[PDB]
Design a protein around this ligand. Structure first.
Ligand SMILES: C[S@@+](CC[C@H](N)C(=O)[O-])C[C@H]1O[C@@H](n2cnc3c(N)ncnc32)[C@H](O)[C@@H]1O
Length: 264
């Protein structure tokens, strides 16, 4: 099934098009991300329709952010490694192509830490910490829509007590020298937030610093740049680890560096 899909669609599609039907897909809650060959375009909707029924999802988006192929409701709750993540699959990014990192995050924190998530999303990286590590968490999310989900996801996981949330730009965050650990899960020229990061950090704090660097420049970057910017503040940093992740071309990785900073 396949089989079931092939039995239904073979009735409406010439055998040549049937052969090209989608063989994989991504499922997030009850929404389906479905990739489609160009020759199947004319039949977009009907194919998404049968896939929807045999796979048991309410909505199908094109994988290819996303084009609605069948259904209407893109909000769903996705469960991963014991975590509940409500989201609007069409408006908010969330790839299991990153699940390892979300798993990793479940381990790294100690119950005592204050953790600040500078780019919270719906709780991508911070929920694992609040739930498994048990530290406290201040989660910052700029987008008001995304924010609703983050707030909700906090209840859904029963951590409203130890996790708080602010709908502002991380640069306006009043805090200073509070953070034992900072999450910088963002990849658009994130070096630009290093200064607010260092401000929010305590001396010795750990920073999970995500960025997108060309492999032309590895393994020098993105650490050199993190290093030099830190110099502008007379602080130092030690590189504790550098994981590769969604190595997503053309030619550019997505890495996360674990770094400890010292406020002199
Ligand atoms: C949701 S994470 C993406 C994680 C990744 N796509 C994944 O699958 O795990 C990026 C978030 O940072 C937020 N953001 C961007 N700039 C921000 C800022 N200056 N202050 C606070 N949040 C910001 C965006 O609203 C977005 O929700």
């Amino acid at each position: 099934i396949k089989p079931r899909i092939r039995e239904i669609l073979s009735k409406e599609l010439p055998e040549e098009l049937v052969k090209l039907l989608p063989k994989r897909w991504v499922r997030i809650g009850d929404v389906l991300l479905l990739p489609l060959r160009p020759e199947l375009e004319p039949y977009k909707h009907r194919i998404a329709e049968v896939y929807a029924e045999v796979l048991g999802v309410k909505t199908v988006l094109r994988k290819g952010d996303y084009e609605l192929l069948y259904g209407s409701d893109t909000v769903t709750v996705h469960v991963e490694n014991g975590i509940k993540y409500k989201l609007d699959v069409a408006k908010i990014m969330f790839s299991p192509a990153n699940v390892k990192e979300r798993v990793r995050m479940a381990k790294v924190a100690k119950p005592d830490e204050l953790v600040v998530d500078m780019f919270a999303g719906i709780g991508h990286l911070s929920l694992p910490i609040a739930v498994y590590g048990k530290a406290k968490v201040i989660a910052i999310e700029k987008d008001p829509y995304t924010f609703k989900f983050l707030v909700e996801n906090i209840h859904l996981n029963k951590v409203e007590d130890r996790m708080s949330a602010y709908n502002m730009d991380n640069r306006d965050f009043p805090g200073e020298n509070i953070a034992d650990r900072i999450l910088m899960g963002y990849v658009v020229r994130t070096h630009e937030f290093i200064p607010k990061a260092l401000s929010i950090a305590k001396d010795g704090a750990i920073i999970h610093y995500h960025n997108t660097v060309p492999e032309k420049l590895m393994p020098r970057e993105p650490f050199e740049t993190f290093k030099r910017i830190t110099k502008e503040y007379g602080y130092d940093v030690e590189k504790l680890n550098e994981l590769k992740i969604k190595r997503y071309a053309p030619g550019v990785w997505h890495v996360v560096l674990d770094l400890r900073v010292f406020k002199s």
